[PDB]
Amino acid sequence: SNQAVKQRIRAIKNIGKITKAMKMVAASKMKNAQIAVEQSRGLVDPFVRLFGDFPAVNSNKSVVVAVTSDKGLCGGLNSNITKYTRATLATTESEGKDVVVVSIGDKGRSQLTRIESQRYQLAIADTYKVRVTFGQASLIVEELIKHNPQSYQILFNKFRSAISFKPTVATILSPDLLEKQLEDVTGNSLDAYDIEASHERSDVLRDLTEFHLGVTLYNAMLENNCSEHASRMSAMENSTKSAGEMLGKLTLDYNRKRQATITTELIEIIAGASALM
Amino acid sequence: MRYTIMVSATASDAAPLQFLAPYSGCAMAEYFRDTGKHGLIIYDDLSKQSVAYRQMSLLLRRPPGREAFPGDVFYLHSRLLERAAKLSKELGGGSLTAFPVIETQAGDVSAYIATNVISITDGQIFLETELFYKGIRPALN
């Protein structure tokens, strides 16, 4: 029974080196993806000051997108926005709203089905395999104009620093389905702007909210992918602590068995010698 | 010192003098138990008294035990600590309060002499070495 406790120190010592490799694998991936997050934060805000920010609208049809990770050593990141999904998918539920639940990331389809499966329609995955691009985030967005909701709900984790990741609900309204209806104040707040398009205001806003959808989608799965690497970094430093505290209790247990087996094999030698002498 | 007796069997002394020193001191503290007064006895490192008794038993060529202890090392401490009693009213009402001290190696309380005195005494005062390093003193677990 002194080799079973020695082969466990074989296990915990390499786990404590696997999980310290993944701590700095996810730490170098946190900083070379930070040079893409703050660049992508630029294009988000001219749409949030042109179209405002209207999360609490009573739309007829909605598409909620909880964008999660693909790999799952994140440490409760893909579950924290899953509870924040239904916290958002019950506040805006006010009159019997049609909802399409979409998951970006392979860890979303395994957790949104547990919470809300009948209004779930789409599952995008394998998106962080090479990198996240705007042309990829346009095709993911263009599959959400196949359904025609009045609003879009994007649930993601805003990468603030390596420690804090507050969840975000970014709302995109369909062009004149509900968006100009919410700008209408004693006239309109959209009538200040001179339209310089080929065609009308009704179909330049059709061009402009798909562009507002594709920008916020590209930022969401880029802020989340950098919030993924910084939660795996805090998860793989809590499991090297746990594989060094387990390794410490297992070396104390091994040294006790090492001492007890030298005493046991010695008493077996003296007893066999005292029986002859 | 006006109320204290100091029985001392140091590390240079013979192992039968260290084995006997808690019984010598218990007999002096039993004077106050048996006359209606109240005693307090501290056996500092009763784990060192079992090591001194392990030495005398191995040199008497008695067979080793679980941790090379004589096997009667429970009776070494049980017959000692049973003398710390609260006597009845017809015996005077005197008392003797024992505080045995056991040194533990790396927090392991599942050792032989540690688990013996736990199954003799009425309670424990566990002193954690991690609460002691944080400055929480007395480091009462």
The residue written with tokens 């007064």 in the block is: B37
Residue type, B56: M
Is residue A65 helix, strand or coil? strand
Q: Which one of A256, A262, A268 would you mutate to disrupt binding with B, by most B Cβ within 10 Å of its Cβ?
A: A256
Q: What is the largest CA-CA distance in chain A?
A: 114
User: Any known ligand binding at B137?
Assistant: yes
- Per DSSP, A195 falls in state P
User: How many angstroms away from the CA of B32 is the closest CA of chain A?
Assistant: 42
Write down the residue that tokens 């934060």 correspond to: A41
CA dihedral B20, B23, B24, B30 (to 10 degrees): 180
Residue that the structure tokens 């040199």 belong to: B59
* Structural domains of chain A ordered from first start: 1-24+236-277 (1.10.287.80), 25-235 (no CATH)
Distance of residue B7 Cα from the nearest chain A Cα, in angstroms: 33
Listing DSSP states for A198-255 in one string gives: SS-HHHHHHHHHHHHHHHHHHHHHHHHHHHHHHHHHHHTTHHHHHHHHHHHHHHHHHH
Helix, strand, coil share (%) of chain B residues, nearest 5:
40, 10, 50
Residue contact B64–A252, C-beta within 8 A? no
Picking from B61, B63, B106, the nearest residue to A252 by CB comes out as B106
Residue B72 annotated as lining a ligand binding site:
no
Closest approach of A17 to chain B, Cα-based (Å) = 25
- C-alpha B45: how far from its chain's center? 7
Report the alpha-carbon distance of residue A132 to residue A39 in Å, rounded: 13
Distance separating alpha carbons of residues A162 and B29, to the nearest angstrom: 64
Amino acid at A191: D
Taking the alpha carbons of A267, A268, A274, A277 in that order, is the dihedral positive or negative?
negative
According to DSSP, the residues that pair with A61 across neighbouring strands are A98
CA quadruple A235, A240, A244, A247: dihedral sign? positive
B45 in a labelled binding site: yes
Distances in whole angstroms, Cα of residue A256 to Cα of each of A2, A8, A152, B111, B112:
10, 15, 62, 9, 12
Amino acid identity, position A158: K
Specified resolution (Å)? 2.8
Is A260 close to B67, i.e. CB distance below 8 A?
Answer: yes
